[PDB]
Amino acid sequence: ATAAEIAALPRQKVELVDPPFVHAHSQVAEGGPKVVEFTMVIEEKKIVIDDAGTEVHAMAFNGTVPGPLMVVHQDDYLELTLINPETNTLMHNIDFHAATGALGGGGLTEINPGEKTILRFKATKPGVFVYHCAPPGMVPWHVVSGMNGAIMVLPREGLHDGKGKALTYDKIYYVGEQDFYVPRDENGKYKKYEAPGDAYEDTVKVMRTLTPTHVVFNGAVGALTGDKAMTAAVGEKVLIVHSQANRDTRPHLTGGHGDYVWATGKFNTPPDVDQETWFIPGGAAGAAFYTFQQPGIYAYVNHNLIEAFELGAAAHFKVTGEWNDDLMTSVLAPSG
Amino acid sequence: ATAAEIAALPRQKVELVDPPFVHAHSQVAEGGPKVVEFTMVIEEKKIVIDDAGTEVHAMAFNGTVPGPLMVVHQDDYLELTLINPETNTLMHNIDFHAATGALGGGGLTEINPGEKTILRFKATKPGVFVYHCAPPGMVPWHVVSGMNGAIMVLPREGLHDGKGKALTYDKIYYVGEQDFYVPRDENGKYKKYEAPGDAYEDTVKVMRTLTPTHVVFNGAVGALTGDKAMTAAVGEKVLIVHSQANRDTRPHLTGGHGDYVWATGKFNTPPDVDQETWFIPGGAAGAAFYTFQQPGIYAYVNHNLIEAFELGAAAHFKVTGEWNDDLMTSVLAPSG
Amino acid sequence: ATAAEIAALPRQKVELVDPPFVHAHSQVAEGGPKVVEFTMVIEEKKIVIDDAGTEVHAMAFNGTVPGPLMVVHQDDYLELTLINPETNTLMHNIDFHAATGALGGGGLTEINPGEKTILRFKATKPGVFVYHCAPPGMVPWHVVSGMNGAIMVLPREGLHDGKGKALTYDKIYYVGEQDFYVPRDENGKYKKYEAPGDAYEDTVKVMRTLTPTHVVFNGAVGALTGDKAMTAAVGEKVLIVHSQANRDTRPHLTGGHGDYVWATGKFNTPPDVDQETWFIPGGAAGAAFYTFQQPGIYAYVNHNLIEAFELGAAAHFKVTGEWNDDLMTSVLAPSG
Ligand SMILES: O=N[O-]
Ligand SMILES: O=N[O-]
Ligand SMILES: O=N[O-]
Ligand SMILES: [Cu+2]
Ligand SMILES: [Cu+2]
Ligand SMILES: [Cu+2]
Ligand SMILES: [Cu+2]
Ligand SMILES: [Cu+2]
Ligand SMILES: [Cu+2]
């Protein structure tokens, strides 16, 4: 496409929503290629990641950890206006794994506090992809401070299984998983810092142990539980997009399965089926499609159970509906 | 199927055998759907896991680590009678990744010492699946204390390759891999405790380092070596089921390959082929099919070689038969 | 084939080249099966792996870490003459994951300093496979001292995508990833030794932490960056072979993708497509095919960014050519 052809394409401004929710979209593309516009303001902010009150100086796209999920269709152009407010103290940029060229856009979006930039790229490949900040010389520090999210490039014909059958979800959730490396004092208590830079040296030492102190979903231990638990109903089809920009994860839906899982997150790669626990390598996004068949509470975890239950990588689903005794039944309840 | 139809299905009791061996079964289903009955008694007991007398208070399904492999066919029902003797001290339950609903059966099988329960679930998805204990609030502790195993849900038509050609094995082995986190005193000596609970705090601390003190097959260093090596003969087809309920592993048959490997453990997902080293994520089981071509000793390991040779994740196969010089030959033996 | 028949096959002597380059070869087999000859001298030597002058007592095949890539075609025979100089201090051998029998050849190639051996095996399976030293009792120590490499067994008809379309690369690079475990003194300073054996005890202690002190490409931090960056031009098809003999890795081409990725490293297993970040388990090799579309610098990393940017797992590609504004463009460059 020439500049003239691209300038002639229709444009659509999209309002982002906070994870785990996803902004309104159409699974099957409506019309021809478009330039989909998004705007995100970067916020360096203090966030609490656990019930004890542990703090992290987060570097957050759109003010959240993970950054929001942007949705477009194959061959659409994603045009992101990225803003680094003067209240911030560090330079930031953005690397879209979905993009081609200049370190994913990273080489063209380096903005200092008080600057903004507009990057446009063609979403040539379908799938879910990670996006993350990556300032030369300070790459992992920004990523493990929460500066990452994901986008979904849907095929123009919507999702299909490995054999051509269409797969239409009723709802979609985006679960961003984050590994945090929080310094501790001699009492084993987590430390607090006045400014983000003050935490750098202590944090890098923890990062080098390759052992996170917290592994969480949606930015905090228990963030997707209670009134914030995800929801579904028996018979409902749910797509769960999951990303980890720096470290491996192994998603599992307790009491369920991944009926179709694009473990690599790429739609042209046939999905695995009937999965118990799938694997998403650090630096990637994956997606699982499931039709709930049983009501009740489900846990959704990173299946290194220590990471799930001790470090924080566990969410819940509340599912409404009728119990199916054919699928499962207590023949004899716990008794003497 | 209707209520009467399920109640009318034949019921069959099966005697279990301890890993790495597998109970009597047919690869191709015999007759229509059946309710296959198994019984397992939970045993809390101290076991020695290395050559230094290191102890672990194991929580063992059927008295073994891993728990035994249960085999059924797709759409059969698995009806487990689970017993928790009054001599035990903790509440236990069971979560079948192969099942649908109630946290895999966990929400319906919580039994205190002195209680038993009977759970039935329809094995709707074909493949090998992990099962493990999962008491709310203490999930990883029970799992990393050895309370996990696996089941195999064979397709009613038996196994097939990607082209639909039948794959029939001569023998099957089940290798359960267990990551242990044993506390040490300040002098580096592994600690011993009177009761399981006494070790809880110390153990969780080691678990949080995400660094196991031991990684073993069949419950101990060297359990599947020497006089306990698994066996085969040239020309024999062997299925090796491998599980890891809490942590990633990467199986490798030294001197062989995985001709067909259902790396995700699910039979409707086409098997990878000609594999050197496959990957099984924590929280899942995988299965490899190999036809032996050379006699001699083989090592079967988790290919992070430190885990295999320093931590304990190494087994052996002793294979009989004639050597094939076409496949391999020493043209010039070691000489000065 | 009989001994006589093999004896009558044509023989071709190959001259090996140091990584990341690969020796001359033809993608499509030239003629019928042949006995491809390779010779490698083992060199125990000191290598400096970081800018702090940190030393490792390398055990290097052909004098490099990783050892060089050997290329043959399916059903050719690979005949390796392995030499252990009298100047070396340890026994060494070689295990080809591509081979069948005698522990991959390890049991037939144990050579003391001053000895040599000749091993021949039939390359029956197509793909990239790891090869590494494995002396009984000291297996991981030699592997994490850099004694590993890989070989590529090309289909006789060259590479093809999942549907049969031929995939022909213009260039090929071999990236060997190495996890190193360097002991430190009380002040956190890396220790130096005057003999491989002297560091054994101290190194095993670090190895047991399963936490490498360094993770590098081609033997050292920066080995494949700056001036030693790999090169290509817009429009060129490049195959990147990557191996890790002991620990998992997750390759990512920053600003690009893996158009076709044989993540398991095996050619009869259809490749995944449109990959952002792929996964290679320790003990295996993988291969990605990509056609460059944008010029500029590309980072190629292990996407656990701490491993890439703190521990050393990062390489560069320098690509020439014209920028494509359709694929990506800076609508508004960084500005106030
Ligand atoms: O899904 N927790 O075992
Ligand atoms: O399978 N040992 O490298
Ligand atoms: O691919 N570097 O984030
Ligand atoms: Cu940033
Ligand atoms: Cu990246
Ligand atoms: Cu239990
Ligand atoms: Cu589970
Ligand atoms: Cu060696
Ligand atoms: Cu090996």
Describe what this molecule looks like in 3D:
The structure is a homotrimer of 336-residue chains. Chain A has 336 residues and is mostly beta strands. Chain A has two domains: 8-155, Immunoglobulin-like (Sandwich); 156-322, Immunoglobulin-like. Chain A is 8% helix and 38% strand. Chain A is built from four helices and 20 strands. Chain A has helices spanning 3-8, 139-143, 196-207, 305-309, and strands spanning 11-13, 35-48, 55-61, 70-73, 77-84, 95-96, 115-122, 127-132, 148-154, 171-180, 214-217, 230-233, 237-244, 251-254, 258-262, 272-275, 284-291, 296-302, 314-320, 328-335. In chain A, the strands form four sheets. The first copy, chain A, has a six-stranded mixed sheet, with no helix packed on it. Chain A is flat. Chains in contact: A-B, A-C, B-C. Chains A and B meet through strand 16, strand 18, helix 4 and strand 20 of A and strand 7, strand 8 and helix 2 of B. Strand 7 (115-122) of chain A pairs antiparallel with strand 22 (328-335) of chain C, so a sheet runs across the interface. It is classed as oxidoreductase. The entry lists the keywords cupredoxin fold, oxidoreductase. The assembly is trimeric.
